[PDB]
Ligand binder design. Structure first.
Ligand SMILES: O=C(O)[C@H]1O[C@@H](O[C@H]2[C@H](O)[C@H](O)[C@H](O[C@H]3[C@H](O)[C@H](O)[C@H](O[C@H]4[C@H](O)[C@H](O)[C@H](O[C@H]5[C@H](O)[C@H](O)[C@H](O[C@H]6[C@H](O)[C@H](O)[C@H](O)O[C@@H]6C(=O)O)O[C@H]5C(=O)O)O[C@@H]4C(=O)O)O[C@@H]3C(=O)O)O[C@@H]2C(=O)O)[C@@H](O)[C@@H](O)[C@@H]1O
Ligand SMILES: O=C(O)[C@H]1O[C@@H](O[C@H]2[C@H](O)[C@H](O)[C@H](O[C@H]3[C@H](O)[C@H](O)[C@H](O[C@H]4[C@H](O)[C@H](O)[C@H](O)O[C@@H]4C(=O)O)O[C@@H]3C(=O)O)O[C@@H]2C(=O)O)[C@@H](O)[C@@H](O)[C@@H]1O
Length: 229
């Protein structure tokens, strides 16, 4: 069937003007100019006339937008302590994921060193001794090591059938995440990352630890924007 390009409507043009698409790995799939120019494929198309839909199969593969300097610029890098407020907003519909998909990262703050933040859908996970299922989680790094003390993981919300709003705010070395209008991470310390000048937003679908290499993660965005005030 005919695949409609995300750029065929106005809703996502502001973010497409500030993003490249990485697919099926971190390799460039489409520059900002190509995205604005109607790039489209099964991995990245306008679903039901209104959703920017990302699809990807395979371990650690992705179909993800990566924040760029606007108007055809190169990769952006900012700092948690640069004094600017860095904000990403979205409205996301996470459908029920097919068998074999276990975790899908849908928004991030990443840098040249490590991910400061991942917001992910996760099928099943115990957090602080409590089992949660089919939910949206934040994983914040407060270190570069691999032991659990390097992470703060939070149950943000159970997955809903309908769209769920997100706002990620970074200001003065602190992180706030608001989900459906309510703060769920309230001023998390990011000062471990002071001086890291290579941070940037991402959003889309990044497939983490699937149990089938052919199972396709699928995530729909009704809205996505990133801004610096
Ligand atoms: O579950 C567990 O076992 C544990 O997992 C933990 O969480 C981890 C998580 O599961 C996941 O593995 C995650 O991976 C990160 C990690 O940093 C990866 O290395 C990778 O990082 C990407 C990055 O996102 C970005 O795409 C980057 O892009 C670069 C790259 O150079 C690329 O080739 C391209 O180069 C460009 C340049 O821009 C250049 O300027 C010019 O443009 O030319 C080249 C070009 O054209 O090729 O773009 C670059 C860019 O845009 O910056 O490439 C990275 C990569 O190596 O692929 O992705 C992951 C991510 O996206 O987050 O790491 C998690 C972790 O370690 O924290 C925890 O949950 C733990 O609790 C748990 O036990
Ligand atoms: O199998 C193929 O040939 C292609 O399938 C493509 O994925 C499909 C899915 O398999 C589903 O059929 C999906 O259904 C959509 C509905 O069309 C509808 O948009 C629905 O909208 C929801 C909304 O998301 C929200 O939850 C709201 O609250 O309720 C709405 C509602 O109830 O209508 O959401 C469904 C969904 O997203 O699951 O449509 C997709 C599709 O892309 O059209 C794809 O895998 C493609 O590569 C295959 O070729």
């Amino acid at each position: 069937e005919f695949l409609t390009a995300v750029s065929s409507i106005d809703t996502f043009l502001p973010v497409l003007n500030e993003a490249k698409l990485q697919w099926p790995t971190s390799a460039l799939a489409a520059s900002s100019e190509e995205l604005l120019g109607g790039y489209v494929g099964s991995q990245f198309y306008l679903q039901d006339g209104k959703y920017m839909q990302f699809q990807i199969a395979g371990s650690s593969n992705r179909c993800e937008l990566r924040q760029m300097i606007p108007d055809g610029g190169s990769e952006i890098g900012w700092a948690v302590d640069d004094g600017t407020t860095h904000t990403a907003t979205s409205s996301i519909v996470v459908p029920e994921q097919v068998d074999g998909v276990e975790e899908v990262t849908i928004m991030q703050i990443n840098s040249g060193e490590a991910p400061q933040l991942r917001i992910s859908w996760i099928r099943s996970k115990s957090l602080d001794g409590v089992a949660y299922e089919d939910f949206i989680m934040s994983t914040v790094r407060i270190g570069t090591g691999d032991s659990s003390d390097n992470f703060v993981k939070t149950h943000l919300a159970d997955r809903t059938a309908g769209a769920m709003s997100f706002q990620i705010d970074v200001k003065d070395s602190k992180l706030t995440i608001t989900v459906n209008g309510n703060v769920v991470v309230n001023g998390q310390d990011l000062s471990f990352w002071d001086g890291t000048d290579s941070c940037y937003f991402k959003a889309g679908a990044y497939n983490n630890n699937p149990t089938s290499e052919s199972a396709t993660a699928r995530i729909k965005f009704a809205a996505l924007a990133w801004v610096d005030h």
